[PDB]
Write a protein that binds this ligand. Structure first.
Ligand code: 4LS
Ligand code: 4LS
Ligand code: 4LS
Ligand code: 4LS
Ligand code: 4LS
Ligand code: 4LS
Ligand code: 4LS
Ligand code: 4LS
Ligand code: K
Ligand code: K
Ligand code: K
Ligand code: K
Ligand code: K
Ligand code: K
Ligand code: K
Ligand code: K
Lengths: 207, 207, 207, 207, 207, 207, 207, 207
């Protein structure tokens, strides 16, 4: 299989829960193991901007998402915000790629500064120290210079800053086509197969 | 009237022509005067990703857009890429706000470095030196550190970096609702009235 | 009216609650709408260093302050520390000026880094990204280089760093005259009329 | 009226007294109130490079300039170099815009470093801390890296660096036409009406 | 005795002469030797904002202050602004701590840049090169980025930036209680005993 | 002969063609060899702001300028914008000094960044790498921080930033006297004799 | 003749007047023209640390030094601290090399920041902008980081920082031999012949 | 006793061996314990520029210096350049102050970069990490920007950069008086009593 076997998928409190849920579903379809984390503010976002009724507590959540995505048993793990027992808290864990989708400006700040307030922030601190893939998907506008400085510091280290800024080059017709464009770019960054967005110019031999 | 009387609207070669066209229409409806500029690459984008058949030459373009938006006569000016006779080339021009929507990574580079290759880039060079409003709407993903450094330099000067990264908090149902979200944010940045996106929490008195 | 119609007034845990309360009263007298936020540590400060018995919960607080200042109904809103439903959480809100008076070194840190831990910090993150007025009133001594770096970053962006450092040039006779000096400077920064501190030299024509 | 009601006009010891005198006259014609300051070295410049015999002491100066410009009584104030009683010494003064025209390299240095040696330098220190308009008009060549660093620091804060570098695009025929070009640019920066330099391209609708 | 035997106390032209005079009195009561310097602008401040009629010339000043504080003979020295014969001009002097209370923004600038215009500025230049204690007590608001950069540079070297920003945690009832709070903090920084401000929490054993 | 035997004189699209033409004439009178380059935008400037009808193509241009200045045969070479065969394209060329007079903000940008878009920009890239004299004569106002950063980078390398900012100390009576002042400063920078501007103070022995 | 024909020699208030006087004598013996400037504090140094009774006023000074060095008539000019009529005030002056020997930390500060307080500081500002030789001879110990930063900025521009730090490699036997070592190094920096310090290793062919 | 009980005195290959030998003698007279290190190049300097015939090997050296200074038995230790067994190699050693007198530009480089090539360089690396006093006495002229950057980095950390730049304010009559001035400044930096240089102004009470 190309790309990582295990992804840590963290959802934080930016207005684009759609992207995290779509990504989780694609990752499940590509038979990857997902370690799923969600912040308190992301729960509010999902409750108010989606028609997904996500249970509050990690075990009920894990059962709900497993059902929602058609996952295999144990394919989606769910860890709470202070569960230091969980793999992402230590670099001695098995190698994961980590994606924060969507990434609030507060989580972006914490990763840039090393705050490690909760398991999402510590998981990203660990990704960085271990040189493991770390992809952040901010959704904010405008971006202030505070935001941009935090993104630049992290980009210069090797994190991938992938804004929820979908393109219009594959004839999008729906909200879902725009969500899929961003998800397709994430999966391309991770090295995981996807067929939602064609390979640009793959047919073009000359001119 | 609140906000600027004249907007310089430049469209460059990023994959989000939809946003520039929607903005142009809203600006026309709010009875503003638009000085409209478009790059060669933006013409290709519009030809391949929209169903707008925009004429090539400035006078035919001006007539086409005037018809497309229901504008008044002389309300939309069109200037070509080397028309140094046009108002945006000099700071002795009447005060405009400038928006580059969408803003390619190449145009973002040129504005950050002061390249002044064409009238769009010189117009933004002039906005900056005159302390006039300058809003850039990039659409790219990932953003590299090259992109982020150019955005940060310009943000620190006072330009507004407003990524085409629409939010999901007003129940979007279509591609057009996502385009309108970004346009609404642009108009809010400019200080121009809009009714596509409500004022968050305007009704909420306590809790 | 000169100056802003709505002020977001945040009180945080520095030893100068007197200044926030006096400002709130002046803003009420100038018929402005105040969106009032207070941190947990600021509640402790007010309980221990003032003779104001402020209720804990936002609705009781709102009623208490309305009475304390002689405000009109709905003139003072109160929002809790995780009330993301409130206007200051989103840049799509109506335009406010924001003042953090007093501004603890922890809140100053969070604004400088973009931490967005609570509604005060996110409100200031939003002020910055929207280019809306942001005034911070620190009260600490010494200022360490950590403090000074955070103040400088924010000043360079455009925030106003206004230390609770009153002057002695208008013959102060009481603690209240010193509190009013600082409040008068805040209101001058905001562009709001005040008659506590004369205009220096307004009578002086020559020498 | 558009633009500021009161301008602090400081003249310092660069070789372009012509520009300060012309500006003072235009400001008087536009019915603004001018708080006029001049350095010791600027007095030497004016005595040696102009045919204006300016009296030395502030009251005689004030009478002379009032006559020279046809000003109204009290329209031009004159303050000496250590007159800390004067409005520009304190940010509690009424809001002025400040222009240093011409701005010597020594005054540029002092403003950049915060030296506050005299009332001109303190007035600019106050403009900066209050976020009031500050325009510097250097006249030097070459500009060394010392000069350029001081200009850049101040530009990045928000001061306007407007070199006495007139353009040739409005058919200048005399020394006075070149002086007026620079003055027209200053007044445009301040937002004050002027009819010496047309609005570039105002007639041009297309091409 | 704890703390330094000799303090160089410089008063400069910020609006807080009260703090310098109170400090001088406390230092006298703690039987320290004070080398007292005052700027021209500080003399104006003291004449206009206090009821202390300080003589102009150093010997008459020295006699006046000796009387004002109840000092012993030779306990207070006074040196003029160009008295390079005085101890603070050379690092070969006996070890002093230096406090600039209050510290104008101009003196802060000069110390940060090394200007050495007068004996106060050279005395602080010498403190720094000798690694002797240097405490600056600014009183200004807002602080601009010029001010903040100068404070940060000096803080990073090891100077103590102690703003005249008194706290409200010891139940202040008068102007004098606020002045004493700042003075108490200065003396704590210097390591000199004081009983105006208790040791916070000294009684608190647990919770 | 003092100063360089060959000057590369590049004219770019800033509003001060007068200075480049006057310099070219003085260089011809001092029997130097000039390698003359002009940009497309500079041709527009010269056509609209002067009464010089300069032919478009390099050979006709060369004949025209030779006649205009009274030059000797082969004394003025003209090279087109993509003529990489010309000496300034390679550092293996004979040693020239280079002057860009006037220097647009776009050419200033390109030299600062190393863009090498055309022969002028590559010629300056080569001057820098070879440590050959490079003088830039910008004419713009205001100078933005973009402009100032590009000027500072180049000044710090060793380029001379000489703004078209003439002085008034030699009693100028006409537009030509102001043009000559700037040209005289250029020639002084190059080390080439000139008698338009006296040596300041050459007669003054004491006081 | 090798090296410059005219030297501007400025003496400022550091404890090494011996070096400036010795240099002045050597420059006179090498038949150079010296434009001699001295600060107020340097006069105090020379009065207290040497047996040279230097007259106060420029004309009497000029006569005294001419006699002291055996100079030719007009070979030494003397200019006062505000004599802007003198050649060093303008870059349009004839080309000089400038040496500040000794260079106080205050003069070093002023040159680094561009303060231009007096003719010495402006003369060095002009040397820098004209790319003329500028040699500073500090005498201080320790050097603080303020001193070192100012020296580094100026060194990076191209000034020569030549500390009064004589070496012991030519068998010094007296105070004068140490003074001559430093003077010999200055003259070597300037390119002026000297026979006080041999050329190291000039005889050594191998090993 | 005031000041440190043990000094690590390192001599490196700059031309001022006189200062290290004089310091060693003064330290011996003040009954301190000296851990003495010398580089290979410093041995050459001492052999060629002094009349001290220092033995090559550490034990013979130790006996020679003990005799030369009249030291007590065990008062001077000598350690070779690779003697990692010696106290200065480890921060677990007893607390020393370290002086590198004279400090070559190569040793200054190594300390600034952390090279730790030999025991002198490691000893200074250890002083820094332990926050123990570190004084460097360079003797070079000019100082290049390489030298100045290394000095500034180390000064900013807390090392004392004390150039062998003696002053002339105590009437020096011989080479030895200049050597003693520098040594006196070193001892003052260390806090060790000395009577070679009086306390400046200690007698001066007023003026
Ligand atoms: C407010 C409105 C209507 C839009 C903003 N949107 C958002 C929606 C909702 C419905 C909530 C609730 C919160 C936001 N925020 C703010 C954000 O969650 C917080 O700053 C928060 O402290 C983040 O903590 P975490 O990093 O998730 O631990 C937030 N943050 C952000 O970076 N991007 C967003 O789109 C939005
Ligand atoms: C390629 C494809 C399929 C997607 C990228 N998209 C884009 C679409 C199309 C259909 C074209 C043609 C070009 C782009 N580009 C590249 C871009 O236009 C260029 O770098 C170009 O030189 C820009 O010049 P201007 O600044 O407009 O003068 C570009 N640039 C960018 O910043 N964002 C984009 O979305 C896209
Ligand atoms: C301790 C004493 C006696 C004085 C300090 N004073 C203060 C008084 C009291 C009585 C309390 C309780 C707390 C402080 N603090 C510390 C401060 O509140 C905290 O660091 C805190 O986490 C701030 O969080 P917020 O930003 O308000 O969310 C604090 N912070 C600060 O910046 N300035 C202060 O004056 C004081
Ligand atoms: C010398 C000659 C012939 C030309 C330079 N010109 C000038 C002319 C005259 C005729 C005088 C007298 C002085 C100058 N200066 C220098 C300048 O005034 C000073 O450095 C001075 O200390 C400035 O203090 P201020 O900032 O005014 O308080 C100066 N400074 C500057 O920045 N630009 C100039 O054009 C000139
Ligand atoms: C103006 C008014 C009403 C308030 C400002 N206040 C002040 C009061 C008075 C009554 C005087 C006269 C001067 C000030 N200043 C300005 C200041 O003294 C100067 O910039 C000055 O050149 C300082 O030089 P020194 O550093 O003392 O040598 C000054 N500077 C500053 O840093 N803080 C202040 O509070 C005030
Ligand atoms: C617009 C008007 C009325 C005034 C500005 N003036 C100017 C006049 C004219 C009449 C033209 C046509 C162009 C300018 N420009 C802009 C400039 O030429 C361009 O940015 C351009 O791309 C430069 O490319 P080059 O570096 O020459 O290759 C330009 N650029 C600049 O740096 N300074 C100027 O004075 C002016
Ligand atoms: C104090 C004593 C005993 C030694 C210090 N020495 C010196 C001696 C004398 C006998 C005087 C009087 C002054 C000094 N100074 C200080 C210095 O002159 C000043 O800071 C001053 O303002 C300099 O202004 P200028 O740059 O000359 O315009 C000064 N400055 C400096 O950089 N190096 C020195 O050696 C000394
Ligand atoms: C050459 C001559 C005649 C004068 C220079 N003087 C010196 C004298 C002698 C007589 C010798 C032999 C060497 C120097 N040096 C160079 C220096 O010792 C070296 O760069 C060397 O590698 C230093 O290594 P260490 O740091 O001691 O381990 C050196 N280095 C330096 O920083 N200052 C000096 O004064 C001198
Ligand atoms: K959480
Ligand atoms: K184009
Ligand atoms: K809280
Ligand atoms: K003055
Ligand atoms: K003074
Ligand atoms: K071209
Ligand atoms: K002087
Ligand atoms: K060695």
């Amino acid at each position: 299989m190309s790309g990582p076997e295990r992804i840590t998928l963290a959802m934080t409190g930016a207005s684009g829960a759609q992207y995290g849920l779509r990504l989780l579903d694609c990752l499940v379809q590509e038979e990857r193991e997902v370690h799923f984390l969600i912040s308190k503010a992301a729960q509010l976002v999902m409750a108010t901007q989606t028609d997904v009724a996500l249970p509050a507590k990690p075990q009920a959540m894990q059962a709900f998402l497993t059902e929602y995505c058609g996952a295999a048993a144990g394919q989606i793990r769910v860890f709470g915000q202070n569960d230091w027992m969980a793999p992402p808290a230590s670099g001695s864990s098995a190698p994961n790629a980590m994606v924060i989708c969507p990434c609030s400006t507060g989580t972006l700040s914490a990763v840039a500064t090393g705050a490690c307030n909760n398991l999402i922030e510590r998981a990203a601190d660990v990704a960085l120290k271990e040189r493991r893939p770390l992809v952040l998907v901010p959704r904010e506008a405008p971006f202030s210079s505070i935001h941009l400085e935090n993104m630049l510091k992290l980009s210069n280290l090797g994190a991938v800053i992938l804004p929820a800024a979908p393109g219009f080059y594959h004839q999008p017709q729906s909200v879902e086509d725009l969500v899929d464009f961003v998800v397709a770019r994430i999966l391309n960054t991770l090295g995981i197969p996807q067929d939602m967005l064609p390979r640009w110019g793959e047919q073009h031999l000359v001119s």
